[PDB]
Structure formats: structure tokens, C-alpha cells
């Protein structure tokens, strides 16, 4: 019997850029419009029921984070709905605040176009009333408003160029904060289980726990909803630990081994 912590993967082919990393395949994203694509899901890495160290579970469709138990009765995935919806809500509020910022800039781009077209229509009438309808003092005063306009356009250009770079960098940065936020939540679900089980279960190191005692589907949920009666299975666990004074030799195959629970584990696992 064994419980595993894992996460979601699927046939998605959407790619986001972080600052340090480009074309990163994520499971859920969102296109903002101007080439800006924000990650919402997590790093899409599809794959003996392995944990979360070298894979994401394509078989876990119920959420983002979850477990994959195994015991006498049977086995199956079970996404943590509390965890997943917390992540979803957090990310959604983030994504929305971005949409909000873009809104003002769109409204800004809108108003500037409005007033820009007003001025030119005003400059035009001035150039026509300087024909149809001290006189020379009104001319160079008009040509001064014109020169100020082109200086205005150069100004709007520069601001636009800057807002674009800051918009991109904002996404590249928020995409890292998101992917990291995911890797955080997943570890938190692992430490939480690790805390409850204690020595009643063996850390496989691949993101899963091997029980020293038989844990039925009821017990599996005690590990999930955080009510694992540790003293309950304590003895038969304490037994099965010692059931299995120098040590033996590590396999000679050009791989570094570390000594744990009286067995040789790879150093490339830690």
C-alpha cells in the first residue's frame, strides 16, 4: 500500500515565456492580446505509479494538485479540490488585475486618439481660415501649435514604447511567480502528508510514501483530510520497520550511493 503526491498534465501545447526561460509548455494559460500570454496552469510534463519528482499525472483530471493512492481495495487519482481552487482563485485575481491595468491603457490609447483627431481638425480649419477668412502674428502662432503637436506625437510614441516593454516584462515576471507558486503548493501537500505519517511510512523519494501498514480507502482519506491517527497504526508500523554490525556494499555501476534504512539509495535522488 502506498500514497503519492502529484499534479496535473495534459495534451496542451500552449507556451509561455518567463524571463530566464522561453517556450515553456504549460497546461493552462491565457492570451491577453498583444502577444502577451500568461501561465495559469503549470509546467506540462506528462509521463509503477510515479509521484511528482519526474512527472505530472495525465490521469489526474479532477484538479491541479492531488494524490494517487494504492492498497488492498484498489487505486485511483484524487485531486485536492481545496488546494486546486485556492490556486485557481489566487491566480485568477492576479490575472484580472493585469486585465484591469491593460484596460486603463486601452482607455488611454482611446482618449489620445480622440483628442489627436480633434487637434488636426482644428489645425486644418486654422490653415483654411488663414486663406478663406498683426495677420502675420497669427501665422507663426499657428505654426507653433503645429510644431508642438509633432513633439506631442513623439511624446506619445515614447510612452507607448515604454508601456509595451513594461507590459511584457510584467508577464514574464508574473509567469515565474505563478510557476513557482505551483511548485510551492505541491511541496506543501507533500510535507503535510510527511508530517502525519512520520515513521509509519517509508519515503520512496519519488514523491510517494510506502506504508509499513495496510491503509484502506478510509485511512487514505484520513491522510488527505488531515486526521491521520498515527498512534493507531503505530505498533504494526513499528514492527514492520524492524521486521526487514557493519553494512553491505553499494552496487558498483559508476553511481554514487547513500546509506538509508539499511539500503543503498542513489545520491542523484536527493
Amino acid at each position: 500500500d502506498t500514497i503519492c503526491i502529484g499534479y496535473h498534465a495534459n495534451n496542451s501545447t500552449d507556451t509561455v515565456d518567463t524571463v530566464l526561460e522561453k517556450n515553456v509548455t504549460v497546461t493552462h494559460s491565457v492570451n491577453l492580446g498583444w502577444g502577451l500570454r500568461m501561465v495559469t496552469g503549470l509546467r506540462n510534463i506528462p509521463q509503477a505509479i510515479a509521484g511528482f519528482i519526474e512527472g505530472g499525472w495525465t490521469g489526474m483530471v479532477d484538479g491541479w494538485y492531488g494524490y494517487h493512492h494504492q492498497n488492498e481495495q484498489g487505486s485511483g487519482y484524487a485531486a485536492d479540490q481545496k488546494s486546486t481552487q485556492n490556486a485557481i482563485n489566487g491566480i485568477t485575481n492576479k490575472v484580472n488585475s493585469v486585465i484591469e491595468k491593460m484596460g486603463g491603457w486601452m482607455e488611454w490609447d482611446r482618449e489620445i486618439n480622440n483628442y489627436t483627431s480633434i487637434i488636426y481638425s482644428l489645425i486644418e480649419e486654422s490653415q483654411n481660415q488663414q486663406e478663406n477668412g498683426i495677420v502675420q502674428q497669427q501665422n507663426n502662432l499657428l505654426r507653433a501649435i503645429e510644431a508642438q503637436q509633432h513633439l506631442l506625437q513623439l511624446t506619445v510614441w515614447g510612452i507607448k514604447q515604454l508601456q509595451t516593454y513594461n507590459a511584457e516584462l510584467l508577464v514574464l515576471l508574473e509567469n515565474e511567480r505563478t510557476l513557482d507558486f505551483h511548485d510551492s503548493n505541491v511541496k506543501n501537500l507533500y510535507e503535510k502528508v510527511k508530517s502525519q505519517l512520520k515513521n509509519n511510512a517509508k519515503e520512496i523519494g519519488n514523491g510517494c510514501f510506502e506504508f509499513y501498514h495496510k491503509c484502506n480507502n478510509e485511512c487514505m482519506e484520513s491522510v488527505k483530510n488531515g486526521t491521520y491517527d498515527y498512534p493507531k497504526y503505530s505498533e504494526e508500523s513499528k514492527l514492520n520497520r524492524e521486521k526487514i554490525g557493519y553494512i553491505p556494499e553499494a552496487p558498483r555501476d559508476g553511481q554514487a550511493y547513500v546509506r538509508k534504512d539499511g539500503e543503498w539509495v542513489l545520491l542523484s535522488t536527493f
Partner: antibody
Amino acid sequence: EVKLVESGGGLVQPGGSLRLSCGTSGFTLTDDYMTWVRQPPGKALEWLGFIRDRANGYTTEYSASVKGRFTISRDNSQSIVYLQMNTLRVEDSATYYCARPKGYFPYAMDYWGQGTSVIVSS
Amino acid sequence: DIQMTQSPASQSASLGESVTITCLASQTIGTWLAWYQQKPGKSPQLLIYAATSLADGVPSRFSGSGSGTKFSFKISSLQAEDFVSYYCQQLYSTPWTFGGGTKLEIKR
């Protein structure tokens, strides 16, 4: 915010047909499991069905009380879900809501529409 | 194909008193259960999901518990707005069926 709005309710005679609409308005992170729900005045809620998005094959599900008779479907480029109802009985007279979960993964219906009234009588 | 018997159908209590609404599921559901609140002439509103988790912007008096086929729903201290209708729903397997409901009323 996200906002659901129904339309297409009104007076319809027995045995006839009617086509409701639900228009998602606002920045949605995903508009996938769009479910239809009805509620006769003074009575309880009743789940009719849902329809996945384009990103899941537009598949649908129903109940053994309206399957075949009703037909959930969404527009190809309008972002509206529809409900084609056929041979409407008097018992079908009720407020019709549309509701879907907040994000991916349908844990519960977060967003609802104000509802639209269907009345089946001569 | 999956039944949801929600009881009681109506309850009476004063302000501050605690009320608990059960919801028995025919087949095994696990944690796939939600709870709503419908004010008169308004649409339902999500309160609890995943059997125990509160939706955002929901008070702490509201709380859900239960797993498998037997689910509860408490309100710590009742208030003026709380005396409306409440429904439970299952989303484990299609059809996502609702319970009968429960109409609360003030005890005067």
C-alpha cells in the same frame, strides 16, 4: 466581472418548442462546463445538462427527464450557449437558469444568470 | 441515477441559534458536494464546495462537513438575511442532482 444573462423566455403553447440563450459577458478564465438549471416557482432546483467548450469536443450531458427532448448547444463564434426545447409540457413551466464553475474543474456552480421565465400553457 | 435526499424541508430558530441541515446521498460521492443560498426572487449562490471548503467572500458562520454519503451544513449564529432557502448539490457524476431544499423562517 463575470456575468451571465439569459434570454428567450416567454409565452409558449403546449407541445410547441422554444430556444433559450445564455450570454457570458466579462473576462472569463474559461467558459467550459456551462450547465442549464430550471426551478418551478416554489419548488426545488433541477439540473438539465451541461456542455463542454471547444477545448473538450463540445460534448454534452443530460438527465433522464429531458434527454433527447432538450438540446444544449453553443454558438460557433458568438460565445452563447443555447437550449432547444421540444414538445414543451405544462410541467416544464419554470424559471430557467444557466450556471457554470468559476475556473477549470467543476467543483461547484460559482456563476449564475438572473434566469428567464418559461410558461407552458394554452 | 443518483439521489440526494436533503432534510429537513423547513426549520425554525431565533437569531444566533445554530441550525444544521443534513443531506444524504444515495450512492458514494466522496467530497464532491456543494451548498447554495437562494434569496427570494434571486438566483442561487455558492457557499460551500468540496464538501467543506467555503467560497470566497463567504462568512465564517457557514460551514460544511461530511464525506461519502452523509453531509452536514451548519450556521453558527443566524442573522436576519440567513432566513432564506438553501440547496445542496452533488457533482461527482452526471446527473449533477440537487437536494429537496430547506426553507428557514424566523421564530417569533
